[PDB]
Design a protein around this ligand. Structure first.
Ligand SMILES: Cc1cc(NC(=O)Cc2cncnc2)cc(O[C@H]2CC(=O)N2)c1
Ligand SMILES: Cc1cc(NC(=O)Cc2cncnc2)cc(O[C@H]2CC(=O)N2)c1
Lengths: 304, 304
C-alpha cells in the first residue's frame, strides 16, 4: 500500500547523458548509438537568443566546434545536422550503454520521468505529465537544457521529451526527440503564451481509484451521474471533457474496485462542487491529475 | 525554476539489485562487493511470521538453500550469517557494478530515495523522509521487501534503509544496512504501534524558503516571532520544536532570500493558525515537510 509520484528507474538514461559545448554554451546531450541529440540553441550566443537564424548560425559551425564529453572521455564529432529544433552530432563511437530505445511523441495528459542533468551529469529524477497546454511543470535551472523525459517498458526506453526552455511564467517547454516542439513554442527568447491549461479528468479519476484501492474512501457517495451531466461540471471547473474512450481506459480500475466509472464521476463532481472540507486524499489536499490509469495499475500491481 | 519531489538518479543502485529465494519466499537483495544483504524474514514460511525464532529457522538452512539471482545469472552462496534483522549471504563473485558506498543510519527528518523492487527488478524511484516516528510513508507491495533507501554524494551511495514490512496502518518499517530497525519495530507479524508522528518543522521552513526562491511569496507577512513563541504554536499543531541548530542549518536559505529565519517562522505560524485559505504553495494545498534544507539548496543550485 501507499501511493507516490514514482519515476521510472533512471539507470538506462544516465548511461546516455553527455555534455555538449559549442563556443561558450554548455548543455546536455543524449548519446544513443553513434548520434548525440541536443537542443539546437547550443549554437547561440546571448545576442542570438532574442531572434536566432539557426540556419545561418549553424553554417559558421564545423564538427570540431561541437565539444562532446561522456564523463571524462571526449567523443569525436564526424557529422552534424539540424532536424527541427535538435542538433544531431554524429560521433565515431557507438554508445556501449545504449539501451533498447524508441523515440515517441506523447499525448497531452500522458506521464513520463525526467532525468534532470547539468554539464552532462544527472542530478535527479521526477515524474511529470505533459499538460493539456503542452507545457510541463518541471524543476529545471540554467544548464538543464538537453535533459530528457522518458517511459520504460520492460527493457525499452521510449524517449518522449527533451528540455529546451523556461517560459517567464516558470513552466517548461521542449520537444520530442525529432526536435518538434510540444505546443506552439519556438526556440527564441520572446515572451510566449502557453494556452489555458485544463485538469486531466481521466487521471484525477484514476487517482481516485488509487485512493479507494489504498483505503481512502471518505469521498465515495450514494450518487451517480451521466457523461453529459458530469461534463457540464468539468467545463465549469476547467477539467477536460470525459469521453467513452476515457471510461474504457478506466475499465480495469472500475473492475478492480467494483465502482462503476460514472459513480466515480459523481464523487469527483461532489469534490469539485464542495471542495475537500479540509480533508486529504492519498496525503494530498488537492485533486491530483499527474497519474494516468496505466500509472495507477502499474504502481498498484508492482510492474518491473 | 519549479520545485519537485526529486529522487536521486537510481542507476548505481539498480546495478546492485538481486533476487533472493529461500524455500517458497522470494524478496530483494542488495549485492555489494561479494556480499548480498536481504531481510532475514526471507527464511520464514507463513506459519513462522506470527512469532519467528530466526536463530532456530536459520539453523535449518544451508548456503545452497539461498537462491541468489542477479538478472539471469545465478550467484554461488559460500557463506551465510545473520546480523540483527538482515541476512548477509557471502557469494563467490564481487559485484562488478558495486559503486563507491557507505552504510549510514539516517536521522529522523532526513530524506532519501527509494528504489522499489520486485523479484530483484527495479520498478520505480521516489523520495521519502524518515518520519520523526521512524516510519516511512512509501509505496510498496508484497515482494518489495529488500528494496533500499539511499542518498548520493558525488559518486558515493550512502545506503540508509532496507524495507521490511508494512504495518496494518499502511506505513512502512525497515532497518539500516546493519539490520537495526528504525523505531521500535520487530520483524514479526504482530500489530505494532508506530508512535505519534510530528511535522518536521525545519523541513517545512526549508520548503517555505524554496517557495520564496520560486516566486510564491503570498504567505510572507509583516510579522516576526521568537523561538519560544513559535515553539508554543509548533507544540499546539504537532510540529517538532525548532532549535538554534535548525536555525543555523536554515542559514544559507535565509542568506539567499534575505528573510530572517524568525520572520519565516512568523509566516509559518500564521499559516498554521489560519490555514491556506484555499491557496497553494509550490502547487501544494498543505505544508510540505519532506524536503530538508540541503534538498532545497541542492535542487535550487543544480548539484550533480
Ligand atoms: C532558445 C531559448 C532558450 C531558453 N533557455 C532557458 O530557458 C534556459 C533554462 C531552462 N529551464 C530552466 N531555466 C533555464 C529560453 C528561451 O526563451 C525564453 C523566452 C520564453 O518564453 N522562453 C529560448
Ligand atoms: C517479518 C514481517 C514481514 C512482513 N511483510 C510485509 O509487510 C510485506 C509487505 C511489505 N510492504 C508492503 N506490503 C507488504 C510483515 C510483518 O508484520 C506486519 C505486522 C506489522 O505491524 N507488520 C512482519
Amino acid at each position: 500500500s501507499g501511493f507516490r509520484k514514482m519515476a521510472f528507474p533512471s539507470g538506462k538514461v544516465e548511461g546516455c547523458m553527455v555534455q555538449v559545448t559549442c563556443g561558450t554554451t554548455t548543455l546536455n546531450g543524449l548519446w544513443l548509438d553513434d548520434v548525440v541529440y541536443c537542443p539546437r540553441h547550443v549554437i547561440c550566443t546571448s545576442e542570438d537568443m532574442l531572434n536566432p537564424n539557426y540556419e545561418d548560425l549553424l553554417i559558421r559551425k564545423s564538427n570540431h566546434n561541437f565539444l562532446v564529453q561522456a564523463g571524462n572521455v571526449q567523443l569525436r564529432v564526424i557529422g552534424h545536422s539540424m532536424q527541427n529544433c535538435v542538433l544531431k552530432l554524429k560521433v565515431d563511437t557507438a554508445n556501449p550503454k545504449t539501451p533498447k530505445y524508441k523515440f515517441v511523441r506523447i499525448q497531452p495528459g500522458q506521464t513520463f520521468s525526467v532525468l534532470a542533468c547539468y554539464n552532462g551529469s544527472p542530478s535527479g529524477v521526477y515524474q511529470c505529465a505533459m499538460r493539456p497546454n503542452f507545457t510541463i511543470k518541471g524543476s529545471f535551472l540554467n544548464g538543464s537544457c538537453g535533459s530528457v523525459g522518458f517511459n520504460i517498458d520492460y527493457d525499452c526506453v521510449s524517449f518522449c521529451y527533451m528540455h529546451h526552455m523556461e517560459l517567464p511564467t516558470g513552466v517548461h517547454a521542449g520537444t520530442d526527440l525529432e526536435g518538434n516542439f510540444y505546443g506552439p513554442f519556438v526556440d527564441r527568447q520572446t515572451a510566449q503564451a502557453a494556452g489555458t491549461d485544463t485538469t486531466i479528468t481521466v487521471n484525477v479519476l484514476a487517482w481516485l481509484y488509487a485512493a479507494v484501492i489504498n483505503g481512502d474512501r471518505w469521498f465515495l457517495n450514494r450518487f451517480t451521474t451521466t457523461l453529459n451531466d458530469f461534463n457540464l461540471v468539468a467545463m465549469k471547473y476547467n477539467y477536460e471533457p470525459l469521453t467513452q474512450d476515457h471510461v474504457d481506459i478506466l475499465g480495469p480500475l472500475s473492475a478492480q474496485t467494483g465502482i462503476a466509472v460514472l459513480d466515480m464521476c459523481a464523487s469527483l463532481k461532489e469534490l469539485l462542487q464542495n471542495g475537500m472540507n479540509g480533508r486529504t486524499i492519498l496525503g494530498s489536499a488537492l485533486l491530483e491529475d499527474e497519474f494516468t490509469p496505466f500509472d495507477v495499475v502499474r504502481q498498484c500491481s508492482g510492474v518491473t
